[PDB]
Scaffold this active site. Structure first.
Site, PDB file in Angstrom:
ATOM      1  N   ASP A  35       1.007  -1.153  -0.014  1.00  0.00           N
ATOM      2  CA  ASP A  35       0.084   0.173  -0.202  1.00  0.00           C
ATOM      3  C   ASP A  35       0.778   1.205   0.028  1.00  0.00           C
ATOM      4  O   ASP A  35       1.336   1.602   0.994  1.00  0.00           O
ATOM      5  CB  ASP A  35      -0.870  -0.155   1.266  1.00  0.00           C
ATOM      6  CG  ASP A  35      -1.950   1.248   1.163  1.00  0.00           C
ATOM      7  OD1 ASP A  35      -2.049   1.793   0.349  1.00  0.00           O
ATOM      8  OD2 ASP A  35      -2.241   1.320   2.347  1.00  0.00           O
ATOM      9  N   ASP A 220      -1.330   5.712  -5.196  1.00  0.00           N
ATOM     10  CA  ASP A 220      -1.836   4.917  -4.046  1.00  0.00           C
ATOM     11  C   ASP A 220      -2.235   3.454  -4.680  1.00  0.00           C
ATOM     12  O   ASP A 220      -3.152   3.248  -5.202  1.00  0.00           O
ATOM     13  CB  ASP A 220      -2.696   5.689  -3.261  1.00  0.00           C
ATOM     14  CG  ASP A 220      -3.322   4.792  -2.239  1.00  0.00           C
ATOM     15  OD1 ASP A 220      -2.762   4.020  -1.779  1.00  0.00           O
ATOM     16  OD2 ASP A 220      -4.411   5.387  -1.572  1.00  0.00           O
TER      17      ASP A 220
HETATM   18  C1  LIG Z   1      -7.763   0.265   3.477  1.00  0.00           C
HETATM   19  C2  LIG Z   1      -7.007  -0.074   2.120  1.00  0.00           C
HETATM   20  C3  LIG Z   1      -6.352  -1.646   2.423  1.00  0.00           C
HETATM   21  C4  LIG Z   1      -7.274  -2.852   2.159  1.00  0.00           C
HETATM   22  C5  LIG Z   1      -8.200  -2.862   0.963  1.00  0.00           C
HETATM   23  C6  LIG Z   1      -7.344  -3.181  -0.366  1.00  0.00           C
HETATM   24  C7  LIG Z   1      -8.082  -3.255  -1.420  1.00  0.00           C
HETATM   25  C8  LIG Z   1      -9.491  -2.794  -1.189  1.00  0.00           C
HETATM   26  O1  LIG Z   1      -9.609  -1.711  -2.195  1.00  0.00           O
HETATM   27  C9  LIG Z   1     -10.573  -0.906  -1.847  1.00  0.00           C
HETATM   28  C10 LIG Z   1     -10.350   0.473  -1.783  1.00  0.00           C
HETATM   29  O2  LIG Z   1     -10.172   1.183  -3.060  1.00  0.00           O
HETATM   30  N1  LIG Z   1     -10.026   1.076  -0.825  1.00  0.00           N
HETATM   31  C11 LIG Z   1     -10.336   0.294   0.332  1.00  0.00           C
HETATM   32  C12 LIG Z   1      -9.659   2.544  -0.646  1.00  0.00           C
HETATM   33  C13 LIG Z   1     -10.606   3.358  -0.625  1.00  0.00           C
HETATM   34  C14 LIG Z   1      -8.844   2.637   0.681  1.00  0.00           C
HETATM   35  O3  LIG Z   1      -9.257   3.416   1.673  1.00  0.00           O
HETATM   36  N2  LIG Z   1      -7.493   2.108   0.609  1.00  0.00           N
HETATM   37  C15 LIG Z   1      -6.567   2.206   1.505  1.00  0.00           C
HETATM   38  C16 LIG Z   1      -5.608   3.149   1.251  1.00  0.00           C
HETATM   39  O4  LIG Z   1      -4.294   3.131   2.219  1.00  0.00           O
HETATM   40  C17 LIG Z   1      -5.936   4.669   1.351  1.00  0.00           C
HETATM   41  N3  LIG Z   1      -4.778   5.421   1.045  1.00  0.00           N
HETATM   42  C18 LIG Z   1      -5.300   6.955   1.365  1.00  0.00           C
HETATM   43  C19 LIG Z   1      -5.745   7.089   2.924  1.00  0.00           C
HETATM   44  C20 LIG Z   1      -6.828   7.580   3.244  1.00  0.00           C
HETATM   45  C21 LIG Z   1      -7.182   7.802   4.687  1.00  0.00           C
HETATM   46  C22 LIG Z   1      -6.212   7.767   5.688  1.00  0.00           C
HETATM   47  C23 LIG Z   1      -5.057   7.400   5.270  1.00  0.00           C
HETATM   48  C24 LIG Z   1      -3.862   7.202   6.476  1.00  0.00           C
HETATM   49  C25 LIG Z   1      -4.406   7.464   7.665  1.00  0.00           C
HETATM   50  C26 LIG Z   1      -3.561   5.766   6.363  1.00  0.00           C
HETATM   51  C27 LIG Z   1      -2.675   7.835   6.019  1.00  0.00           C
HETATM   52  C28 LIG Z   1      -4.564   7.146   3.824  1.00  0.00           C
HETATM   53  C29 LIG Z   1      -4.250   7.995   0.895  1.00  0.00           C
HETATM   54  C30 LIG Z   1      -5.430   7.490   0.100  1.00  0.00           C
HETATM   55  C31 LIG Z   1      -5.991   0.932   1.789  1.00  0.00           C
END
Ligand SMILES: C[C@@H]1CCCCCCOCC(=O)N(C)[C@@H](C)C(=O)N[C@H]([C@H](O)CNC2(c3cccc(C(C)(C)C)c3)CC2)C1
Length: 377
Positions: A35, A220
């Site tokens: 990630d 990302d």
């Molecule tokens: C939760 C997921 C890990 C499990 C799922 C992987 C495949 C599923 O695919 C669905 C999908 O597209 N999902 C679930 C997006 C919508 C999401 O939420 N993906 C995440 C990213 O880390 C998000 N990264 C960002 C982000 C947003 C909010 C907070 C943070 C922190 C606090 C960690 C810095 C980081 C920078 C955009 C990984």
């Protein structure tokens, strides 16, 4: 010696790409999602209906408790757990062992996926966005400090179930064609970049380029979709709707909710446009573009009926936290995260998506005046 790392990623479509890792002594094997949009290394450490195995601190002689709690809220999904350190290895990676921070996940909500085959997440971004705070060293910073592994890695994510490569410490020249084009990492927190121009089927969206980066633009691998700011999302959906007005789609298809299906092998690829993202270059007034095919932003899914129809979900969604170049965007390309030189490289991947008359591209140089004004402040 990068060949040992080619094809070391697996995944199900829309469910991320993972690499095989070991934690603890004796080594416990876990599949860890890679990630680039977070900075915490975390593993399931307690039974869960969707987990097939998990980290057992009780069985690792090298485990060390940090006596500190932790929780990470993503855009969608969250978990909480206990912090600690342990020895970690990447079997299909460099031949090293690092002492790394590990968050032992004990509770989670809408995070693990049913029958997904991964049990943890490896956040490859910078300490500044680490939880609980930037003093928790992210895994890759530990790897670089503790070993001789150079400070960069590259991701080749291949489409549809899915596979790819994470080259740790270098660039494998057999995974791409053409030249690599680099864009500056604007700030070392997320992998933040600056988009300077957007075109659909060759037509400039003609928006103030600050809108593309409101309030940031990032790369990302942990987000599936291309996510655009509201104003940009509306312009692009307006333009994609018009190019494909030949056919009719439910308005809930454009919101990512409903599928669209066609009798197998008759998907009307030609009526969906290509999207060109222009990125800030390395020299003054110079940019380059990446071209996204519709095969990238129409994600294939499972037929709800008993048919062999090809079915797809629209993988461009609206955002209120900036542009996210997700896995859908990275699939065409070999993507080099050159942390040592604060830049990100793009090239056409050896496993690139194939259209009948069109091809994903990385092309430069372009001249773009006033690229600095495109950054949001
Ligand atoms: C939760 C997921 C890990 C499990 C799922 C992987 C495949 C599923 O695919 C669905 C999908 O597209 N999902 C679930 C997006 C919508 C999401 O939420 N993906 C995440 C990213 O880390 C998000 N990264 C960002 C982000 C947003 C909010 C907070 C943070 C922190 C606090 C960690 C810095 C980081 C920078 C955009 C990984």
């Amino acid at each position: 010696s990068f060949v040992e790392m080619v094809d070391n990623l697996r995944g199900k479509s829309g469910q991320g790409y993972y690499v095989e890792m070991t934690v603890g002594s004796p080594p416990q094997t876990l599949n860890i999602l890679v990630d680039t949009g977070s900075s915490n290394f975390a593993v399931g450490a307690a039974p869960h209906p969707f987990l097939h195995r998990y980290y057992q601190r009780q069985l690792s002689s090298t485990y060390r408790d940090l006596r500190k709690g932790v929780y990470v809220p993503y855009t969608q999904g969250k978990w909480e757990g206990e912090l600690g350190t342990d020895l970690v290895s990447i079997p299909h990676g460099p031949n090293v062992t690092v002492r790394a921070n590990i968050a032992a996940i004990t509770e989670s909500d809408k995070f693990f996926i049913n029958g997904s085959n991964w049990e943890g997440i490896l956040g490859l971004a910078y300490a500044e966005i680490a939880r609980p705070d930037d003093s928790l060293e992210p895994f890759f910073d530990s790897l670089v400090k503790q070993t001789h592994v150079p400070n960069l890695f590259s991701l080749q994510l291949c489409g549809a179930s899915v596979g790819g490569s994470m080259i740790i410490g270098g660039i494998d020249h057999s995974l791409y064609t053409g030249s690599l084009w680099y864009t500056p990492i604007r700030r070392e927190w997320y992998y933040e970049v600056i988009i300077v121009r957007v075109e659909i089927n060759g037509q400039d969206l003609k928006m103030d380029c600050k809108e593309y980066n409101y309030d940031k633009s990032i790369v990302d691998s942990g987000t599936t979709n291309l996510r655009l700011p509201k104003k940009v999302f509306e312009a692009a959906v307006k333009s994609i709707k018009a190019a494909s007005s030949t056919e009719k789609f439910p308005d809930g298809f454009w919101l990512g909710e409903q599928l669209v299906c066609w009798q197998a092998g008759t998907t009307p690829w030609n009526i969906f446009p290509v999207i060109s993202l222009y990125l800030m270059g390395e020299v003054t007034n110079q940019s380059f573009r990446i071209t996204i095919l519709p095969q990238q932003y129409l994600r294939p899914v499972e037929d709800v009926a008993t048919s062999q129809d090809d079915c797809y979900k629209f993988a461009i969604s609206q955002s209120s936290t900036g542009t996210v170049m997700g896995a859908v965007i990275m699939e065409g390309f070999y993507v080099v995260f050159d942390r040592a030189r604060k830049r990100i490289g793009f090239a056409v991947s050896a496993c690139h998506v194939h259209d009948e008359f069109r091809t994903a591209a990385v092309e430069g140089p372009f001249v773009t005046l006033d690229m600095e004004d495109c950054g949001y402040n």
